[PDB]
Nucleic acid binder design. Structure first.
Ligand SMILES: [Mg+2]
Ligand SMILES: [Mg+2]
Ligand SMILES: [Mg+2]
Length: 430
DNA sequence: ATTATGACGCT
DNA sequence: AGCGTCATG
């Protein structure tokens, strides 16, 4: 009762750019705006692989991981933008730079954790305290929340989507106790006001729209963000969790979309995240381990403690290329030429990183895949990264992987390589 | 023949 | 250290 902590101590947002690479290309080329359009990598094989899709194109069933030729079957007027190619490979610099634009705006409002190229967690607890002290018991106007959904509302005693949104927001705001500076629901609401401001700033200053979730922890904020896309934000209160989770497939919660989630479903004979509440913490630990079990026990009650890490920059800088089927690398000359191309992109990005961010990577990780192995990586070997020099990096990479050549001949490479990956890691300030 | 990343856990 | 899992622009 009075001692059961409810995980309502923080205000956490998750901001996710809508169809991010598409928006980057639509900003650059206005002919693509407000059209079904997608971004593809490469072009020769089945038209290129789609990696981002505008919401107009999603209405036709176009999805990521679809070949552009197949997408064109669903969407004959689909417009396509291609990722830049440099040194024979896809080069994502434009999108990384656009991401930095967005991350720097977000960082004006609060500490952020860069969770991916297009999404960041925001710890708003402090900012909310500040804004609450400035409001001085002033109620919160619905006008301050023009794109906010309150998950679970309206309920009880309305034909159009915006009307529903406003009905729910009105129910929520009329129930609020703005006299209480420590009300978690009030804190979430002020958090949503700040996120409206953040999203307005991002769109004003970059052109890019985003969606966002506001809740008490990262998992709920991420879940919330997905509920109303695009260009909307969703507040998931602690009180909304039982109904929300009662029909939520386990695979929708971040980290449960893979093998672990499938085992939770199969071992416990459940489907929805709310069904987890009927197990003791010890039961969950016995099936899924101490860490997972404790996490599941709290998470199915809406409680999670994982902090928003203060980290706006990537921890690693990597370059990767697949060589599928017939294009696999079967000669030493091939392997060395591509190691060099990857190393040259890596050197460029590393030198820029050192200039922008006052750090140097100290470890080079070399990963390969060989023909036949169904794993992402067949082999991972690290070595010292002591100078930002592509020729040295490519030579060292060849050094750590050359023993994998089964071929008795010096010039041939067997089994041929279907993937090369160079990753710079272990940064130190400089 | 989706690809190209990136974070983090396990042992 | 090297491997595996999860996410998925
Ligand atoms: Mg996104
Ligand atoms: Mg994202
Ligand atoms: Mg996505």
């Amino acid at each position: 009762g009075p001692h059961m902590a409810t995980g309502q101590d923080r205000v956490v947002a998750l901001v996710d750019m809508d169809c991010f690479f598409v928006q980057v290309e639509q900003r650059q080329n206005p002919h693509l705006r407000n059209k079904p359009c997608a971004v593809v990598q490469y072009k020769s094989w089945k038209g290129g692989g789609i990696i981002a899709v505008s919401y107009e194109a999603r209405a036709f069933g176009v999805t990521r991981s679809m070949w552009a030729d197949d997408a064109k079957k669903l969407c004959p007027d689909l417009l396509l933008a291609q990722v830049r190619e440099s040194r024979g490979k896809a080069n994502l610099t434009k999108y990384r730079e656009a991401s930095v634009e967005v991350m720097e705006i977000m960082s004006r409002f609060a500490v952020i954790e860069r969770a991916s190229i297009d999404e960041a967690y925001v710890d708003l607890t402090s900012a909310v305290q500040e804004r609450l002290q400035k409001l001085q018991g002033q109620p919160i106007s619905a006008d301050l929340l023009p794109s906010t959904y309150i998950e679970g509302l309206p309920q009880g005693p309305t034909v159009q989507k915006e009307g529903m949104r406003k009905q729910g927001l009105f129910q929520w705001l009329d129930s609020l106790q703005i006299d209480n500076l420590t009300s978690p629901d009030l804190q979430l609401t002020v958090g949503a006001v700040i996120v409206e401001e953040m999203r307005a700033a991002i769109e004003r200053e970059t052109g890019f729209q985003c969606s966002a979730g506001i809740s008490h922890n990262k998992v709920l904020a991420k879940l919330a963000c997905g509920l109303n896309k695009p260009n909307r934000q969703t507040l998931v209160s602690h009180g909304s969790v039982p109904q929300l989770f009662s029909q939520m497939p386990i695979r929708k919660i971040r980290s449960l979309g893979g093998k672990l989630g499938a085992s939770v479903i199969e071992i416990l004979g459940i489907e929805y995240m709310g069904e987890l509440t009927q197990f003791t913490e010890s039961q969950l630990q016995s099936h899924f381990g101490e860490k997972n079990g404790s996490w599941l026990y709290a998470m199915c009650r809406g409680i999670e403690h994982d902090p928003v890490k203060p980290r706006q920059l990537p921890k690693t800088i990597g370059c990767s290329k697949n060589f599928p089927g017939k294009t696999a690398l079967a000669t030493r000359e091939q392997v060395q030429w591509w190691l060099l191309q990857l190393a040259q992109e890596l050197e460029e990005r590393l030198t820029k990183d050192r200039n922008d961010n006052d750090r140097v990577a100290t470890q080079l990780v070399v990963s390969i895949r060989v023909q036949g192995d169904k794993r992402l990586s067949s082999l991972r070997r690290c070595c010292a990264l002591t100078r930002y020099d592509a020729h040295k990096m490519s030579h060292d990479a060849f050094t750590v992987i050359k023993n994998c050549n089964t071929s008795g001949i010096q010039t041939e490479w067997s089994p041929p390589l279907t993937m090369l990956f160079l990753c710079a890691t272990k940064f130190s300030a400089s």
